[PDB]
Amino acid sequence: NAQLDQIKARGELRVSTISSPLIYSTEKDTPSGFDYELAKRFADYLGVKLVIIPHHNIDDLFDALDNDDTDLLAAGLIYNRERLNRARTGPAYYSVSQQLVYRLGSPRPKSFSDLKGQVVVASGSAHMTTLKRLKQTKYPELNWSSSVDKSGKELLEQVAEGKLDYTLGDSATIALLQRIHPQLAVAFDVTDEEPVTWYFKQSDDDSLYAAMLDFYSEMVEDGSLARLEEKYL
């Protein structure tokens, strides 16, 4: 049978995520996050239980999606053309800018020419693509690396604790973490707004994908998706 039939027979919609106040947070009894809330409503729409699996590594998320270990990715993921070989994006929900973060009390960098330490980002993130682009063009001196086991949220926490000098994160996540870690500061903006979307496996089977688009249509219809977006942004 088709993808949706299998989901219905499992009685569960398997969604892979990353822990963050914007995506999926369990810092108290009731979980929260935009991706979590939208995924719950989607599971309800399909008539199945939601099964969330938070990961740390984006490359792993895409491998799971390709291996049918999960049904969709809902993890604050920025559009990345390299992911289209095996995956397809759902509709765009909101946009975020990429910002370079440093810790208050330490020197404020003025540009990528002025960094003292390394900038570390999450492996497979769109943040990584941006750094590669800049190093091959305007900043040959740029010292950067990728973290295989830390998320953008965990990387921001490291900057806050003084264990990492800088990270390149998204504007929405930075804003939320700042209310818990006021020592996090923006040195400068790096990119203009980029859209966030869910990802699904590319297949000739649209039993799930078409349902996702039907669900999205219903959500937009009375301005309900806008309200939800604005609540977390």
Q: How far is the CB of 8 from Cl ion (least distance, A)?
A: 30
* Strand spans (E) along the chain: 12-18, 49-55, 72-73, 87-96, 98-103, 119-122, 144-147, 167-170, 184-189, 194-201
CB 112 within 8 A of CB 138: yes
Residue 32 per-residue DSSP state: B
Q: 78 or 155, CB closer to Cl ion?
A: 78
Judge contact between 7 and 48, C-beta under 8 A: yes
73 or 219, CB closer to Cl ion? 73
Length of the chain (residues):
233
Stretch that binds Cl ion, among 9-17, 72-80, 87-95, 181-189 (CB under 5 A): 72-80
Q: Using DSSP, state whether 185 is helix, strand or coil.
A: strand
Q: Which is nearer to Cl ion, 78 or 160 (CB)?
A: 78
**Residue 70 in contact with Cl ion, rule: CB under 5 A:** no
Q: What are 115's two structure tokens?
A: 């960094």
Stretch touching Cl ion by CB under 5 A, among 66-74, 82-90, 123-131, 189-197: 123-131
Tell me if 74 contacts Cl ion by CB under 5 A. no
Q: Which is nearer to Cl ion, 3 or 123 (CB)?
A: 123
Backbone angles phi, psi at 7, to 5 degrees: -60, -45
Of the two residues 77 and 187, which places its CB atom closer to Cl ion in the complex? 77
126 binds Cl ion (CB under 5 A): yes
Q: Give the nearest distance from C-beta 25 to Cl ion in angstroms.
A: 18
Residue 78 within binding range of Cl ion, rule CB under 5 A: yes
Residues ≥6 apart with Cβ < 8 Å to 65? 16, 72, 73, 86, 87, 199, 200, 201
Task: Point out which span in 126-134, 140-148, 195-203, 223-231 binds Cl ion (CB under 5 A).
Answer: 126-134
Identify residues 11-50 at the interface with Cl ion (CB under 5 A): none
Which stretches of the chain bind Cl ion, using CB under 5 A? Answer: 77-78, 125-126
